[PDB]
C-alpha cells in the first residue's frame, strides 16, 4: 500500500536517470501524502521542473523549493507549512528521504535525499521515505554539488509521478 513515486533527474537539460522512492504513508501519512501529491502534481505546482538547489557530497541532496528555488519558501499541499508528524523513522543511511525544515514544525515542500548515515538529524527532521531504485543516479548528481551546497551544474527533476 506504501506509495512509490519517482524523479527523472537531468544534468543541464540532458536526462541523467530515474530515482524512485517508497513513501511510508503508514507511519507518516500527511508527510507522505504531501510528497506523493507534489511528485505527481495533483494541484498545479509540485516538484516538476524544480531543482536541487543544495547538494553536499557525503551528506545530502536537497530540493523541493519549487516557488523560490533557493530554500526560502516552497509550499506543501496545505497552504504553506505543517507540523512534524513524528520521528519514528531515523536517518539510517543513504537513500533516506527526509523533510528539510527551518526549525521545528515547519515542513513545507522541501526535502533531502541522504547519501550517508545522518543520525544527528534524528528528532529534528521527519524521515518519511527512501530511494527504492536509482541510488546511483542520486550519487551521480551528488558529484555536481559542493561544500556549501552550490551545484556546479543544473540538476533538475525533468519529470515525476506515482508508479503505485
Amino acid at each position: 500500500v506504501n506509495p512509490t513515486v519517482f524523479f527523472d533527474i537531468a544534468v543541464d537539460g540532458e536526462p541523467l536517470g530515474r530515482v524512485s522512492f517508497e513513501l511510508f504513508a503508514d507511519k507518516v501519512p500527511k508527510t507522505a501524502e504531501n510528497f506523493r501529491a507534489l511528485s505527481t502534481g495533483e494541484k498545479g505546482f509540485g516538484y516538476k521542473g524544480s531543482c536541487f538547489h543544495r547538494i553536499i557530497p557525503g551528506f545530502m541532496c536537497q530540493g523541493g523549493d519549487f516557488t523560490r528555488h533557493n530554500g526560502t519558501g516552497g509550499k506543501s499541499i496545505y497552504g504553506e507549512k505543517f507540523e512534524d508528524e513524528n520521528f519514528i523513522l531515523k536517518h539510517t543511511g543513504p537513500g533516506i528521504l527526509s523533510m528539510a525544515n527551518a526549525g521545528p514544525n515547519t515542513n513545507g515542500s522541501q526535502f533531502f535525499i541522504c547519501t550517508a548515515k545522518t543520525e544527528w538529524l534524528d528528532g529534528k527532521h521527519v524521515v518519511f521515505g527512501k530511494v527504492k531504485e536509482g541510488m546511483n543516479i542520486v550519487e551521480a548528481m551528488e558529484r555536481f554539488g559542493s561544500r556549501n551546497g552550490k551545484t556546479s551544474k543544473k540538476i533538475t527533476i525533468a519529470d515525476c509521478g506515482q508508479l503505485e
Binding site: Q62, D65, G71, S98, A100, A102, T106, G108, Q110
Partner: peptide, 6 residues
C-alpha cells in the same frame, strides 16, 4: 531558509 546541516 530551510535545510539540514552536518
Amino acid at each position: 531558509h530551510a535545510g539540514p546541516i552536518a
